[PDB]
Amino acid sequence: NTVSNKYLGETEIQVLAPGQSPAATPTKADKNQVVIDTTVIARNTVAMLHDV
Amino acid sequence: NTVSNKYLGETEIQVLAPGQSPAATPTKADKNQVVIDTTVIARNTVAMLHDV
Amino acid sequence: RDMDRIVDRSYTLADESTVQGFALKSFNVPVVPSNRFPKFSQGAAHHKLSNA
């Protein structure tokens, strides 16, 4: 009934002093989805006598 | 004296609910005609003596 | 790139297919587009690997 996918990015960079042991930088993520719930029809009936 | 041509309309569409059984839509028609009722003549007379 | 001297073929200094960098014919040297130049950040921290 639906479809989805994900995005991610941005690992970062930082300076390193000798023996600094610097903290990490996060990478976020997100998703996008689509839904299907509607239909369309064309009926257009035809009579019998008018057909002959 | 006449001949005719016929045309067909266009169908339009509508949304369907589950189990709706939607009412249909018409497609009109029309005709065109041409009548032929007149003639055109050109006439000239020349006498024999004036021809000689 | 947009100037008429480069674009018009009649001028002696004209180059075709000028999308990936072109040869400037006044002195015949190559010019290449580069996406990355420094951008001033209005008093942000000093750029990495920079020391007093």
Of A38, A41, A45, the CB nearest to B13: A41
Let me know the angle formed at the C-alpha of C42 by C37 and C48, rounded to the nearest 5 degrees: 60
Question: Residue C14: helix, strand or coil by DSSP?
Answer: coil
Cα B31 from Cα B7, distance rounded (Å): 6
Q: How does DSSP classify residue C46?
A: P
The two beta strands, B14-15 and B2-8, are: unpaired
What is the phi/psi pair of residue A5, to 5°? Answer: -155, 175
- Residue B19, sorted as left (phi over 0), alpha (psi -120 to 50) or beta, turns out to be left
Where in A1-52 does DSSP place strands (E)? 2-8, 29-35, 40-41
Amino acid letter at A40? Answer: V
Chain B residues with CB-CB distance to A37 below 8 A: none
C49 touches chain A (CB under 8 A): yes
Give the residue from B23, B32, B28, B22 showing the smallest Cα distance to B10: B28
Q: Which of residues 1-52 of A touch C (CB under 8 A)?
A: 13-15
**Reported resolution in A?**
3.9
Cα C48 from Cα A51, distance rounded (Å): 84
A neighbour chains, 3+ CB pairs within 8 Å: B, C
Chain A residues near any Cβ of chain B (below 8 Å): 38-45
* HSE-CB of A35 using CA atoms within 13 angstroms: 2
Give the residue from A45, A40, A38, A46 showing the smallest Cα distance to B13: A40
Amino acid letter at A50? Answer: H
| Widest CA span in chain A | 96
Cα A41 from Cα A39, distance rounded (Å): 7
Question: Residue B48: helix, strand or coil by DSSP?
Answer: helix
Cα A44 from Cα C7, distance rounded (Å): 58
Chain A residues with CB-CB distance to B13 below 8 A: 40-42
Long-range CB pairs of B4-12, under 8 A, 24+ apart, other chains included: B4/B31, B4/B32, B4/B33, B5/B31, B5/B32, B6/B30, B6/B31, B7/B31, B7/B32, B11/A42, B11/A44, B12/A42
Cβ atoms within 10 Å of C13's Cβ, excluding its own: 13
